[PDB]
Ligand binder design. Structure first.
Ligand code: HEC
Ligand code: HEC
Ligand code: HEC
Ligand code: OCT
Ligand code: OCT
Ligand code: FES
Lengths: 29, 37, 281, 31, 159, 166, 214, 32, 214, 159, 281, 29, 166, 31, 32, 37
């Protein structure tokens, strides 16, 4: 049942990472 | 029917976005950019 | 009792409105909680906890009119395919957590509708259900997806018997309008304690008489108090019968998206270098 | 607990990927 | 970072700046710096989050409609919780309808009310910011109140 | 020799006035089109069906429901109407507060709405809850082994006032 | 030869490229200025998945619920398309709210952008209408009673109330006609309306440019 | 219905700051 | 005050008026040059009446025919809206043909207006598709067998034929799925497609102006 | 009649004329002479004719579909008569499909074929006009043939 | 005969395919025409002419094998509500045109399905039907609109009897393969003329023997010719049950449109005068 | 039954007249 | 120090290559979505219904249809299949020329299509008309008082060739 | 026959209307 | 089905010339 | 189903429109307008 946890984790991570890449690409916001 | 996940996302994003906007406004208030009017 | 629910309402414990039938006899409302996983894999044993909390230091009124501790009971309506896990499939820890619970189906071909109780309330405020999830791979009637779970939780003695007769665990109003002159006692048939009140009516032991020596009451006024300290509460929950393949492919897609984002940013960096070198933007 | 490690290192992993691609493509005279 | 200063020697740009426009004539190049490279990041991010939510928490299919059985719970979607609350709190139905209609109409009136000054920064707009925060708090109050029993609407289960 | 602004505006008024006439003429049937057609008047509406949309047989209905029994039927237009040894009037089950179908409680001799806690007596007049008005009535005229519900236009025998549903 | 020159001589692609590359983004534009765009993204998702579901959904009291179940259980990736539709609907409304927060807290509604704000409010009403109409298409308990409990509201309006209600539910009670009208509203009317007003919105924004620094 | 809600709110609130921090870090190791 | 100046300062109506009044019509433009416009008129009619009929038509094998009869017999002016829809469909195709006659017999397709002609052909295919999909919506003998006798045609295509046919009829035989897909095509897909290509058409015409004298 | 001559002293107009454009710079004013006054005449005329046809000859509602009974007559709408004829005349189904597809494809090819000369007038386009008249006559032949028995397709009930 | 049609096919003379049942016994095809108004007003008597043309100089074969002139017959399927006009409602001229025709319904509650014939073909190649249109104003089942009309027209003797037995008005093939040696005559039961042909089979008088003295024929070859000179033909038509109000309002709308067009042109003329005076276009 | 005739006549007339008014307004085509 | 066109194009290839990967990944489920789901395989398809969509009872069917009788049923997938003392094979009624349902003529012992005049014998092979192929066959295996039609994959006993419908 | 007269005079009528409106509005110094 | 067809064709053909003639006549009585 | 009225309208309008176009083309061929190329 770890795959479920990794699923939700993947959601959180893609959210965090989207924000991070927008901040990086636009040079900080 | 009340959905706790969706509701949480709504509330959280609303609060953090409002706080963010006031932060940005505060930054420009402290340090006015060019044509800052 | 829950078997009185399946006796009076054989087809289902859930009315079309979504109301659990226990509320037809248990008239008081008390909070009931549920704990189910957000999602489960197929052919998996998981835990479903029905919480029926009350004050143990506060006792109720027994049939004979004396105090007694109260028992707890519940009905758990699971999605189609779900059922109480076979004992061979239950881990030892979960076995320890369950206790001496006698899981019963509401009827045949209704294994997803489990009834439980009465149980000693002082030891079973949390009832643990060992549930086995079904598997779409070997049943065309079972599909992955989000389904409802309907929980009913109950404390203390009810107010109405299946025959339609009231229990002593009730508030007794009146019969007419006049002056109280019948505050006595005594009996006839069995033992216990009975009270004769006219203005004819009779009230059993249990409820405390709030009317004393000669009161000018009207039709509808309360002769006694409300001895009920229990109650019934129902709640809805949701569970996702999840497919591991869906999640795996999801993770892959997410990884690809993140990689793509990285490449886009790096590309922009390269272009920034070029624009710094050149001068046409 | 598992969710915490999984979140942190992933994240840590993909940050390693981003930095490694940055200095990598830099050393490969592309960036 | 690529940046272009505003050419203040161009009367066309000055004329636009006087009218509150011309703010797309200076700064970082839209293309390709933002449009081609950053926008797809946002699109893919949004899509990925939505897809992940869809997979991990799929849409539920309830029970068939029953015109003779009113469910114990009846709520619209979350974004209608405030209005709904109003609708179920006011004894006068007409007043409720008027209040409901007042939201987009009042919102429409906002620019014509705050055109009294050209300030954009909330810290230079104390009254407007105060009114906004108030309205937002009230809106949240009503929205949370919608999911509670009617008896606990003006309290939200607090005092 | 040359038409002035007055003549131009007058000619505009005539011309585009006529054109506007054409537009209205074309618009009338459309507007009426979107307005839903009449169901069918038979003295103010008749008949009463059940949940399957089948016509209710009185002889069969009375053999499935005892005395004092209350049963939802598809009354006027489609609204859930309470049929109550047949009773000469039917009670509308749609609440007056907001419109939830209010269930009947014989144990407390009154209708009790689960939405916001509105209560109506045995006849169906409001005694509690945020419900402002009383449940609507209909003439439950039984004939040829069918239940004919018609619009109650007589005096409300519960409040004395003219029916709020007219 | 060269195909590009062929398409260039006719479409005048060079002018388009020059116009696009003549625009710049001012320093005060931060991440919140994405929200509007994000809202659009959500709608595009709604447009795609929505369209997809019209290939299987059936707007009849007899067939609606069953068609939805069919989409969830039998249609290839149907569960995905529908779930995406749900979540992206909710997210569209949320992102729209956050976008309004941005616009108001940057004063971007003031002169000369009032019509963009008004257009915006209209867009919000349209979006909420999408939500309300879609919510009841599965014809389950939740959606059906969501309609029933709100279909009688306009009747509060003195002279034209009953008429409005009748026009909305296709009769004096909620039934098949209501479902038909809600489906037409949801898959025909509102898409075109929101297209027109989004067009006005975007044209006006592009015409005037983003509002100035704070 | 308070646990999952508050959890979702907290996460959707703080992950923003985590991503902000990560982006800032990438900017610093970039040399912008 | 003056509201017009308010709307002018923002929408720049004066520029629009100048642009509109800067255009002229050359002597060689005769009455046949109306045909294209007339075609559009027909489509607009189709758009209106069509929309109207979505408020009563029901795309189910059980309900379709009955809903059409209901429109013809019970709906206020329903007979009118539907009959208008029929005739204006036929007239749209006819006027389109006559328009092609004009364009070809005036050489208006030649450089640099090739993409307008191609766009046109695409528009013709789309229009005929409207016709074919609509023809079978009443689910009468004529329409149903119009589908059945043509749904198996793409199967002639070697490798992808059966797949194409299955995609068109929503299965390997004509039934409810076919009706659903035809209705989606007819009231969602084709309206948007024809909107996009009409837009390209008109934009290109306005950009280039009418072709020269003969 | 209001008319404006083409300003042949304007290099922009000349440049457009050289490219086959600029023909909206001269002649009768579009607005309001044509757009505001003549266009509504055409719109109202079209609408009135269509409405009259609709009233005098209303749409017919046939009989319910019967999957087990093939009607004696099966025809698409008139504008599909030619293609249909082809489809029911050619023994090879694939060839019929290709022929059917050849119509819009060939039409698409027309400008690239006739760009060999810039002539617009059919009387200066003898070959093209001949081909067009031929194709039109053939199209009518097929269309009329569609409504006749298959045995009389290449004849139309003549020779 | 048409009454054989209503005898064998009681429910309807029209098959689900649209094929008229007369074609099951009348195997030859001859052209049949119809004349109905494009539209009619409600409660109006109008004429419907069924044309069943043939060559009168060409005679057919009678049951006994001799020539006879042929008779004509028809079935007219009108829309619901339509029926044969009452004689009180028929004008004298139409009465003159009709003749001695006996209009019959196909059955009860089927007044819109009329059968006619047999009639002397030399005097009834055109059959005139006096039809009364219904009125939507006093019948909720009748609506204005376009409806189908199904016509079947027939000449000459049929080929199949209701019992399933062939008639003499037929072509006679063969029975087996061999050599013809039976070209005789004579009888037994009744009168008339019979022919005995083996190689056993018998063919009645009427069809002309195309096989003479000793022919080596095969199984399937034609022993005789085809004496049939008649035939059946069916046709569909349409009629519009029209409302006078619709047409009136139509005329009004048209007039308004024309007036509007005039005003537009005149307005343009005024503007042309102004543009001639001024100079800014 | 003359009203029917006048109906069809009204169609023919509005067709003819539309053509006539376009010819008049555009000064001859 | 400064990336040349080769490096820019290479970086473009990598970046937009990955993005393209994302697009394809998103596109796969959609493409598969529009492809109609499988009906349900039971040895190649089974069962056979009538015009009302009800399952055909063999005992009831044989009491309503005599010997040599031909009756259309909803065979495989929904296609009109001829049921012919039960026959061990069913004939597809959809024409091979263009697909009209061809009626049966016992008087001429052959199927005759009304559309363009195609003819098939008692078994269903083309003998006339523009129809290029023979009518399809199906195994009409009768069991448990129901007719089970399955896909004919054996040798065509009329032409000897492999079934053109495979 | 009726259709012919009805067509011709209507037409004749509306042409009379057009001409009458032309010279009418002309005499009324409008055109 | 030849009578009504040929009639419709003839009418839709010639009414054009009738309208052309009427428009021309109006032009002549106008004085263009 | 063949509709004679509609078919007639189609044929008639097609023929008269073709003839009209050839007439117009002939007019411009006989008398070339300005920029007539
Ligand atoms: C992500 C980081 C961002 C940011 C910072 C901005 N956007 Fe959007 N954008 C989109 C559309 C349809 C418009 C209006 C039409 C148009 O302007 O051409 C905009 C507009 C803007 C502007 C103003 C532009 C100007 O000329 O001043 C700005 C400053 C802006 N946006 C910021 C569409 C999208 C979109 C998907 C379709 C996405 C993703 C974004 N935008 C994201 C962002
Ligand atoms: C109540 C107000 C309002 C609503 C609701 C609204 N808009 Fe906006 N929006 C504005 C205004 C005003 C601007 C321009 C502000 C500026 O120039 O700074 C804007 C800007 C935008 C922008 C460009 C800048 C940005 O911040 O994104 C986009 C894209 C956009 N809107 C899309 C949408 C979409 C899509 C919707 C709904 C479907 C929507 N908006 C709803 C008022 C609104
Ligand atoms: C096969 C060719 C073709 C088809 C089909 C076609 N177009 Fe055109 N059309 C053209 C070309 C090329 C022009 C420009 C010719 C010129 O400039 O002289 C044009 C011009 C026009 C014009 C302006 C001039 C005029 O003659 O009307 C309109 C309006 C128009 N088209 C609308 C439409 C509509 C609406 C449709 C279908 C729904 C359509 N067209 C279909 C090729 C086509
Ligand atoms: C309830 C868990 C909250 C975790 C928040 C982490 C980011 C602040
Ligand atoms: C058959 C009648 C034709 C009338 C034509 C009138 C115009 C040429
Ligand atoms: S379809 Fe059977 S013959 Fe043409």
């Amino acid at each position: 049942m770890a795959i479920l946890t990794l699923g939700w984790v993947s959601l959180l991570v893609v959210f965090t990472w989207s924000i991070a890449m927008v901040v990086w690409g636009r040079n900080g916001l | 029917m009340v959905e706790p996940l969706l509701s949480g996302i709504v509330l959280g994003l609303i609060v953090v976005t409002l706080a963010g906007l006031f932060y940005a406004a505060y930054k420009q208030y402290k340090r006015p950019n060019e044509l800052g009017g | 009792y829950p078997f009185w629910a399946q006796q009076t309402y054989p087809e289902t414990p859930r009315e079309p409105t979504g109301r659990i039938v226990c509320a037809n006899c248990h008239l008081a409302a008390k909070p009931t909680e549920v704990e189910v996983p957000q999602s489960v894999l197929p052919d998996t044993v998981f835990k479903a906890v029905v919480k029926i909390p009350y004050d143990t230091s506060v006792q109720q009124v027994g049939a004979d009119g004396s105090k007694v501790g109260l028992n707890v009971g519940a009905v758990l309506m699971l999605p189609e395919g779900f059922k109480i896990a076979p004992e061979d499939r239950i881990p030892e820890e979960l076995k320890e957590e369950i206790g001496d619970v006698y899981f019963q189906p509401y009827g045949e071909d209704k294994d997803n509708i489990v009834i439980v109780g009465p149980l000693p309330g002082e030891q079973y405020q949390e009832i643990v259900f060992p549930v086995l999830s079904p598997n779409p791979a070997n049943d065309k009637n079972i599909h992955f997806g989000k389904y409802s779970v309907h929980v009913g939780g109950n404390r203390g003695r009810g107010q109405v018997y299946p025959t339609g007769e009231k229990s002593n665990n009730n508030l007794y109003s009146a019969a007419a309008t006049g002056t109280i002159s019948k505050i006595a006692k005594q009996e006839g048939e069995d033992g216990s304690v009975k009270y004769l009140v006219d203005i004819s009516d009779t009230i059993p032991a249990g409820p405390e008489l709030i009317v004393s020596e000669g009161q000018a009451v009207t039709a509808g006024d309360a002769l006694t108090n409300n001895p009920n300290v229990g109650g019934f509460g129902q709640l809805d929950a949701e569970i996702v019968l999840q497919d591991a393949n869906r999640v795996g492919w999801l993770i892959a897609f997410v990884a690809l998206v993140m990689l793509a984002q990285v490449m886009l940013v790096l590309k922009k960096k390269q272009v920034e270098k070029v624009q710094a070198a050149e001068m046409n933007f | 607990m598992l969710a915490i490690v999984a979140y942190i290192g992933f994240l840590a992993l993909f940050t390693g990927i981003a930095a490694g691609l940055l200095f990598g493509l830099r050393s490969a005279k592309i960036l | 970072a690529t940046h272009k200063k505003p050419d203040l020697s161009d009367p066309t740009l000055r004329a636009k700046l006087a009218k509150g426009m011309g703010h797309n004539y200076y700064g970082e190049p839209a293309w390709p710096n933002d449009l081609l490279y950053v926008f797809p990041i946002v699109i893919m991010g949004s899509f990925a989050c939505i897809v992940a939510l869809a997979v991990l928490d799929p849409a539920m299919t309830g029970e068939p409609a029953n015109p003779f059985a009113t469910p114990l719970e009846i709520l619209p979607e979350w974004y209608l919780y405030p209005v709904f609350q109003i609708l179920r709190s006011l004894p006068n139905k007409l007043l409720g309808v008027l209040a409901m209609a007042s939201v987009p109409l009042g919102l429409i009136l906002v620019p014509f009310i705050e055109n009294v000054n050209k300030f954009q920064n909330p810290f230079r707009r104390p009254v407007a910011t105060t009114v906004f925060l108030f309205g937002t708090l009230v809106t949240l109050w009503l929205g949370i109140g919608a999911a509670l029993p009617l008896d606990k609407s003006l309290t939200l289960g607090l005092f | 020799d040359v038409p002035d602004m007055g003549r131009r505006q007058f000619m505009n008024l005539l011309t585009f006035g006529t054109v506007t006439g054409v537009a209205l003429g074309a618009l009338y049937p459309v507007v009426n089109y979107f307005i839903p057609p009449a169901a069918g008047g038979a003295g103010g509406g008749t008949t009463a069906k059940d949940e399957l949309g089948n016509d209710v047989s009185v002889s069969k209905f009375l053999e499935s429901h005892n005395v004092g029994d209350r049963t939802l039927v598809q009354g006027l237009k489609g609204d859930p109407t309470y049929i109550v040894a047949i009773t000469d009037y039917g009670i509308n089950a749609v609440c007056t507060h907001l419109g939830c179908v209010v269930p009947w409680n014989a144990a407390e001799n009154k209708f009790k709405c689960p939405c916001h806690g509105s209560q109506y007596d045995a006849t169906g007049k409001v005694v509690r809850g945020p419900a402002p008005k009383s449940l609507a009535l209909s003439h439950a005229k039984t004939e040829n082994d069918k239940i004919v519900l018609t619009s109650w236009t007589e005096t409300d025998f519960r409040t004395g006032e003219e029916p709020w549903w007219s | 030869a060269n195909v590009y020159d062929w398409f260039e001589e006719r479409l005048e692609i060079q002018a388009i490229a020059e116009d696009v590359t003549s625009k710049y983004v001012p320093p005060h534009v931060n991440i919140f200025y994405c929200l509007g765009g994000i809202t659009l993204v959500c709608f595009l998702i709604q447009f795609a998945t929505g369209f997809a579901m019209t290939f299987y959904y059936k707007p009849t009291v007899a067939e609606a619920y069953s068609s939805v179940q069919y989409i969830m259980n039998e249609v290839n990736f149907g569960w995905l398309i529908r779930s995406i539709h749900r979540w992206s609907a909710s997210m569209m409304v949320l992102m729209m709210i956050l976008h309004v927060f941005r616009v108001y807290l940057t004063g971007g509604f003031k002169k000369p952008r009032e019509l963009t704000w008004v257009s915006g409010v209209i867009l919000a009403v349209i979006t909420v209408s999408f939500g309300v109409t879609g919510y009841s298409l599965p014809w389950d308990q939740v959606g059906y009673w969501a309609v029933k409990i709100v279909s009688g509201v306009p009747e509060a309006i003195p002279v034209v109330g009953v008429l409005i209600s009748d026009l909305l539910r296709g009769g004096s009670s909620v039934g098949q006609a209501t479902l038909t009208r809600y489906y037409s509203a949801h898959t025909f009317v509102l898409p075109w309306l929101i297209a027109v007003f989004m067009l006005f919105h975007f044209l006006m924004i592009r015409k005037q440019g983003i509002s100035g620094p704070l | 219905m308070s646990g999952e809600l508050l959890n979702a709110a907290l996460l959707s609130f703080g992950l923003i700051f985590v991503g902000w921090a990560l982006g800032a870090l990438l900017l610093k190791i970039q040399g912008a």
